[PDB]
Amino acid sequence: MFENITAAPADPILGLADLFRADERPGKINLGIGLYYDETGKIPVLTSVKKAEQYLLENETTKLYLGIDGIPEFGRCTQELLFGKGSALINDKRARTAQTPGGSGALRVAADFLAKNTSVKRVWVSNPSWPNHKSVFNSAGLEVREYAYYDAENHTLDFDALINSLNEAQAGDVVLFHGCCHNPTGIDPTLEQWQTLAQLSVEKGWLPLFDFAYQGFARGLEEDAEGLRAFAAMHKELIVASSYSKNFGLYNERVGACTLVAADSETVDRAFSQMKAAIRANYSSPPAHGASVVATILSNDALRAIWEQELTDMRQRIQRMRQLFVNTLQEKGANRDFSFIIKQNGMFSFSGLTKEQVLRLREEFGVYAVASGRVNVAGMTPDNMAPLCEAIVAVL
Amino acid sequence: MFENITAAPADPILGLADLFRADERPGKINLGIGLYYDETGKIPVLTSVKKAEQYLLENETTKLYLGIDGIPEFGRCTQELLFGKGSALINDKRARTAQTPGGSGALRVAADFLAKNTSVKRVWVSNPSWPNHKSVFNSAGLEVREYAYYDAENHTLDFDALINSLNEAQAGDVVLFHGCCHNPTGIDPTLEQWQTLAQLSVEKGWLPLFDFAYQGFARGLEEDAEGLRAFAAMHKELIVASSYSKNFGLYNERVGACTLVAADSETVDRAFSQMKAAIRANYSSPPAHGASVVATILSNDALRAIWEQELTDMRQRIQRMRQLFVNTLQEKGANRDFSFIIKQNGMFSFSGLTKEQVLRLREEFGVYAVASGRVNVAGMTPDNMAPLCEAIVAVL
Ligand SMILES: *Cc1c(COP(=O)(O)O)cnc(C)c1O
Ligand SMILES: *Cc1c(COP(=O)(O)O)cnc(C)c1O
Ligand SMILES: O=C(O)CCc1c[nH]c2ccccc12
């Protein structure tokens, strides 16, 4: 039965880490996968998290299945982070959140939900986009179309190009937006552009789907929610796929959420029932650990204060490595002018290196960047900055 | 977009838990969902688990994404528990295991894998079977057919009916077997019926799929693996969906595995790349906690020794409630003879109560039993025995 199975191609991202892990070279650098690293080059557990884990260790008395939609309080806190103190969505009981296994799991969930309960046929994703996006949608039998987004020549958001691209998108079509920290570009619309887009999708009849995996890494918790929030003010309906993988360093515990928003409660409940159904036929209930850690942290004023500060510490550190990257490049005599690098937010940067230069960097210098030339800034450190910056310069 | 969504029908199992919750009646008894309770009526964390958890608390230095297939040690450990210490399967590098989010997610992973990569068009599940089976397979766009299995009249496995209905299973059709502790019947084939079944499927060209969710609750670890192990001895190809939910009390942490078996390494590797592909488009990578907990325990001789004893205590305890159940019934009225109840394995007994009798137990007496008339013996305790058995005599 398996005699003819074809080996699957490799994950452009995931499969890189393997390549990395397997290289016996000494001073290898990893600018591939988006993982936050510290000054010392390690991927640490936040202390707020260790604090929460102790608490759970001490207080948990059962491992009883969670509800299909997960830990209630986790949900509540998620909606508050997403939408705000007074948001109507909340007061109007217009949003239902399901805790899922990662931001990834929430995308699949929304996908299966849409493919089975709606007349959605295609999903519009930006170009470029996070490669996993097409696979997840394709798996649910949905069609993935792309909309222009990035001005490579200028290193910015090509608004009209974007706008002109979407016009081709029909009403009842799903339009996928990155909450903040566009992966892989690092360019996010301005509050006005977001406003625009908002009004626009209202009129075109688009279902907005937000992929929000970096809340807190661009400007801040509350500011990075501005575009969502602008959409949330005009829309009856929307879907939100958030992740706690990055802002809490909980990568492997698979923590994320799927938020559904209908015009009203009677509606959101019905729909949600369909979403829970989709979950039931998938993994059933979500893993409690990571989510319990998150609810604890956001529930508690002390822990929360501590976590928020570690988050602000991670962000500021990336902001710092960015300035450091540009200057060191420059100080090493790079051809090009890399200052656009500073106007980018989040962990990455679209470095503008060719497929061949990234290949070269790897084989030759042991530097691992994604073929898109996407470099993980959060993987840079004052110690590797020099060697990193030289290989780049040697390939330019 | 969500205007016309119809609400779904609640989980025939999960649904009840909700009702249960919502029920204010002081002395409610919950014989629905399969959760192991203790003398005191609580659903506890295993000691070996708390121990492994502290260990992680103190030793983990990163939350770094796991591989798509999860913890290697976990895989190794599961294979050994499945096939046995020195299996050929293991020496010939013929089995690849993926850590999954519960036995559930492992079923969905095998499903999606099958649907997308093999031309399997239908799945044969026993009747009666675990309700969630249909939904998983169906979601993968797979056809669920049923094969005869239980002799309602004499409370047993109807071998002929079994055999006779499988004839209509074409070659290359997937045949789903319960490794042990048949859910919901409690009747499992004898090594000989397994042997025979084995032979048959070879001869008929079926792909065997094992749902192994109760390893260790019937007789013991090794003893419950004799059916599988027999099949692994004749098969070239196999799939195993196993859960650590019940035997480790790790319900909410989502711990299970999906083991693929092929004629050889090359084959298994190729195939498995396809399985990993299906995972990627799903939840990406699995939740570490639970599995880490499982690997820690099974790799450490001491913790392992403590765990096997807790497992053995759980099993023994169920066996006790079993004989006490029948005895109490008798000793309290009961027109029927419930002795068949003692030859049944695992957590539940197929009580032979009707849909209306169960409705009544609930409504009237506050006892929760599935509509199939399936009762969780593990939820029975010396303290609730009496009342339970009395409200049982009241509906006969
Ligand atoms: C990381 C990421 C996700 C989800 O990641 P998880 O680990 O599954 O939470 C989703 N979208 C983008 C753009 C991401 O970078
Ligand atoms: C409980 C159960 C499973 C797996 O449950 P998980 O909690 O997802 O591991 C699989 N099969 C049967 C028959 C079960 O009863
Ligand atoms: O009753 C069972 O089969 C085990 C408990 C149970 C009810 N619904 C479930 C769905 C997934 C996993 C386990 C369960």
Contacts of B223 (CB under 8 A, 6+ apart): none
Instruction: Give the count of beta carbons closer than 10 Å to the beta carbon of residue A356.
Output: 10
Calpha distance A192→B336 (Å, rounded): 75
Is A2 inside any structural domain? no
Helices assigned H by DSSP within A118-158? 132-139
Is B298 inside any structural domain? yes
Q: Are residues B324 and B303 in the same domain?
A: no
Pairs of CB atoms within 8 A across A/B: 220
Residue B390's domain is classified under what CATH number?
3.90.1150.10
Q: Which of B8, B104, B280 sits opposite A277 (nearest CB)?
A: B8
List, as one string, the DSSP characters of B187-241: ----HHHHHHHHHHHHHHTPEEEEEE--TTSSS-TTGGGHHHHHHHTT-S-EEEE
What's the CA-to-centroid distance between B12 and ligand 3, angstroms?
10
Q: Are residues B58 and B175 in the same domain?
A: yes
Instruction: Give the count of beta carbons closer than 10 Å to the beta carbon of residue B338.
Output: 19
Which residues is B146 bridged to in the sheet? Answer: B125
Residue B149, token pair as written in the block = 């299995």
Which residues is A368 bridged to in the sheet? Answer: A30
Calpha distance A207→B95 (Å, rounded): 43
Q: Which of B259, B107, B101 is nearest to A254 (CA)?
A: B101
Is A386 inside any structural domain? yes
Which residues is A97 bridged to in the sheet? Answer: A259
Is B1 inside any structural domain? no
CA dihedral A171, A174, A180, A181 (to 10 degrees): -120
Burial of A90 (0-12, 13-18, 19+ CB in 10 A): middle
Strand pairing class (B95-100; B256-261): antiparallel
Is B132 inside any structural domain? yes
Q: Scanning every residue of chain B, which has its alpha carbon at the shortest distance from the alpha carbon of A102? A: B283
Is B51 inside any structural domain? yes
Cβ–Cβ gap B33/A65 under 8 Å: yes
Task: Dihedral sign for Cα A227, A147, A102, A68, please.
Answer: positive
Calpha distance B14→A296 (Å, rounded): 26
Calpha distance B198→B184 (Å, rounded): 22
Q: Which of B383, B239, B374, B366 is nearest to B324 (CA)?
A: B383
Q: Which of B225, B243, B32, B211 is nearest to B137 (CA)?
A: B211
Q: Are residues B27 and B58 in the same domain?
A: no
Calpha distance A372→A16 (Å, rounded): 13
Q: Which of A54, A260, A273 sits opposite B8 (nearest CB)?
A: A273
Which residues is B147 bridged to in the sheet? Answer: B126
Q: Which of A322, A276, A318 is nearest to A68 (CA)?
A: A276
* Ligand 3 surroundings by CB, under 6 angstroms: A 284; B 13-14, 33-34, 104, 130, 132, 183
List, as one string, the DSSP characters of A289-345: HHHHHHHHHHH-HHHHHHHHHHHHHHHHHHHHHHHHHHHHHHHTT-SS--GGGGG--
How far is the CA of A322 from the CAs of A376, A378, B284, in angstroms?
10, 9, 29
Residue B172, token pair as written in the block = 């290359």
Calpha distance B283→B286 (Å, rounded): 7
Q: B-chain residues within 8 Å CB-CB of A262?
A: 2
How far is the CA of A383 from the CAs of A304, A328, A346, A347, A361, in angstroms?
31, 12, 21, 18, 18
Q: Are residues A32 and A65 in the same domain?
A: no
Cβ–Cβ gap B45/A64 under 8 Å: no
Cβ–Cβ gap A117/B5 under 8 Å: yes
Residues of A with catalytic annotation?
130, 211, 246
> What SS3 state is found at B5?
coil
Q: Scanning every residue of chain A, which has its alpha carbon at the shortest distance from the alpha carbon of B264? A: A3
Q: Whose CA is nearest to atom 6 of ligand 3?
A: B33
Decide: A279 and A291 in contact? Cβ < 8 Å.
no
In degrees, rounded to 5, the angle at the alpha carbon of residue B12 between the alpha carbons of residues A272 and A76 is 30
Instruction: Give the count of beta carbons closer than 10 Å to the beta carbon of residue B48.
Output: 25
Return the half-sphere exposure (C-beta side, CA atoms, 13 A cut-off) of residue A172: 9
How far is the CA of A156 from the CAs of A128, A160, A166, A189, A323, in angstroms?
13, 12, 18, 9, 18
Decide: B261 and B232 in contact? Cβ < 8 Å.
yes
Calpha distance A95→A97 (Å, rounded): 7
Burial of B56 (0-12, 13-18, 19+ CB in 10 A): middle
Decide: B113 and B141 in contact? Cβ < 8 Å.
no
Q: Which backbone phi and psi does A109 adopt, to 5 degrees?
A: -55, -45
Calpha distance A73→B357 (Å, rounded): 37
> What SS3 state is found at A54?
helix
Q: B-chain residues within 8 Å CB-CB of A208?
A: none
CA A58 to chain centre: 32
Q: Which backbone phi and psi does B368 adopt, to 5 degrees?
A: -105, 120
> What SS3 state is found at A219?
coil
How far is the CA of B156 from the CAs of B124, B153, B182, in angstroms?
20, 8, 11
Decide: A63 and B49 in contact? Cβ < 8 Å.
yes
Calpha distance A136→A148 (Å, rounded): 20
Residue A271, token pair as written in the block = 């729909």
Is B111 inside any structural domain? yes
The CA R_g of chain B, rounded to the nearest whole Å, is 21
Decide: B379 and B34 in contact? Cβ < 8 Å.
no
> What SS3 state is found at A224?
helix
Contacts of B322 (CB under 8 A, 6+ apart): B341, B342, B344, B349, B377
Q: Residue B363 sits in which domain range?
A: 11-44+316-396
What's the CA-to-centroid distance between B132 and ligand 2, angstroms?
9
Contacts of B289 (CB under 8 A, 6+ apart): A253, A287, A289, A290, B56, B253
Residue B240's domain is classified under what CATH number?
3.40.640.10
**How far is the alpha carbon of A334 from chain B, nearest alpha carbon, in Å?**
33
List, as one string, the DSSP characters of B123-163: EEEEES--THHHHHHHHTT-EEEEEE-EETTTTEE-HHHHH
Q: Which of B8, B62, B263 sits opposite A43 (nearest CB)?
A: B62
Instruction: Give the count of beta carbons closer than 10 Å to the beta carbon of residue A203.
Output: 10
Resolution (A): 2.3
B34 marked as binding residue: yes
Q: Which backbone phi and psi does B253 adopt, to 5 degrees?
A: -95, -5
Cβ–Cβ gap B283/A139 under 8 Å: no
A94 marked as binding residue: no
Q: Which residue out of B104, B187, B347 has the highest number of ligand 2 atoms within 8 Å of its CB and is therefore the one to mutate? A: B104
Q: Are residues B218 and B367 in the same domain?
A: no
Q: B-chain residues within 8 Å CB-CB of A285?
A: 102, 252, 254
Q: Which ligand is nearest to the CA of A281?
A: 3
List, as one string, the DSSP characters of B61-81: -------TT--HHHHHHHHHH
Catalytic residue among B130, B194, B206, B307: B130
Decide: B185 and B344 in contact? Cβ < 8 Å.
yes
DSSP state of A37: -
Residue B200, token pair as written in the block = 């048959």
Q: Which of A366, B19, A118 is nearest to A395 (CA)?
A: A366
Q: Are residues A80 and A193 in the same domain?
A: yes
Calpha distance A386→A380 (Å, rounded): 10
Calpha distance B186→B379 (Å, rounded): 15
Q: What is the 3-state secondary structure (H, E, C) of B262-307?
A: CCCHHHHHHHHHHHHHHHHCCCCCCCHHHHHHHHHHHHCHHHHHHH
Contacts of A320 (CB under 8 A, 6+ apart): none
Cβ–Cβ gap A65/B252 under 8 Å: yes
Q: For tokens 């230095």, what's the residue?
A: B61
Q: Are residues A196 and A56 in the same domain?
A: yes
Q: Which of B61, B252, B283 sits opposite A105 (nearest CB)?
A: B283
Residue B227, token pair as written in the block = 């059916």
> What SS3 state is found at B91?
helix
Residue A175, token pair as written in the block = 């339009």
Calpha distance B165→B151 (Å, rounded): 14
Q: Are residues B166 and B184 in the same domain?
A: yes
Burial of A207 (0-12, 13-18, 19+ CB in 10 A): buried
How far is the CA of B187 from the CAs of A122, B145, B184, in angstroms?
47, 20, 9
Calpha distance B194→B162 (Å, rounded): 12
Q: For tokens 């047993």, what's the residue?
A: B156
Q: Which backbone phi and psi does A169 adopt, to 5 degrees?
A: -85, 125
| Domain final residue pick, B300, B315, B330 | B315
Q: Are residues A235 and A373 in the same domain?
A: no
Decide: B133 and B144 in contact? Cβ < 8 Å.
yes
Calpha distance A57→A51 (Å, rounded): 10
Instruction: Give the count of beta carbons closer than 10 Å to the beta carbon of residue A109.
Output: 30
How far is the CA of B296 from the CAs of B54, B55, B286, B292, B301, in angstroms?
11, 9, 17, 6, 10
CA dihedral A276, A282, A284, A289 (to 10 degrees): -110
Decide: B104 and A284 in contact? Cβ < 8 Å.
yes
Residue A111, token pair as written in the block = 């996908």
Q: A-chain residues within 8 Å CB-CB of B262?
A: 2
Q: Are residues A20 and A104 in the same domain?
A: no
Q: Whose CA is nearest to atom 2 of ligand 3?
A: B34
List, as one string, the DSSP characters of B317-384: HHHHHHHHHHHHHHTT--SS--GGGGS--SSEEE----HHHHHHIIIII-EE--TT-EEEGGG--TTT
Residue B49, token pair as written in the block = 């688990």
Is A5 inside any structural domain? no
DSSP state of A364: I
Q: Which residue out of B245, B253, B259 has the highest number of ligand 2 atoms within 8 Å of its CB and is therefore the one to mutate? A: B245
- Rounded to a whole number of angstroms, the distance between the first and last alpha carbons of chain B is 49
Atom of ligand 2 nearest to the CA of B241: 10
Q: Which of B227, B200, B193, B195 is nearest to B211 (CA)?
A: B227
Q: Are residues A158 and A61 in the same domain?
A: yes
Cβ–Cβ gap B274/A117 under 8 Å: no
List, as one string, the DSSP characters of A367-383: EE--TT-EEEGGG--TT
Strand pairing class (A367-368; A122-127): unpaired
Q: What type of residue is A153?
A: E
Q: Are residues A80 and A168 in the same domain?
A: yes
Atom of ligand 1 nearest to the CA of A183: 13
Strand pairing class (B174-178; A207-212): unpaired
Q: Check if B184 has its Cβ closer than 6 Å to any atom of ligand 2.
A: no
Which residues is B375 bridged to in the sheet? Answer: B349
Q: A-chain residues within 8 Å CB-CB of B42?
A: 61-62
Decide: A92 and A113 in contact? Cβ < 8 Å.
no
Long-range contacts of B136-140 (CB under 8 A, 24+ apart): B136/A281, B136/B104, B136/B107, B136/B108, B136/B111, B137/B107, B137/B111, B138/A281, B139/A112, B139/A278, B139/A281, B139/A282, B139/B108, B139/B111, B140/B108, B140/B111, B140/B112, B140/B114, B140/B115
Calpha distance B379→B33 (Å, rounded): 9
Contacts of B50 (CB under 8 A, 6+ apart): A57
Q: B-chain residues within 8 Å CB-CB of A16?
A: none
| Domain final residue pick, A315, A342, A376 | A315
| Domain final residue pick, A299, A315, A331 | A315
B194 marked as binding residue: no
Number of domains in chain B: 2
Q: For tokens 């688990």, what's the residue?
A: B49
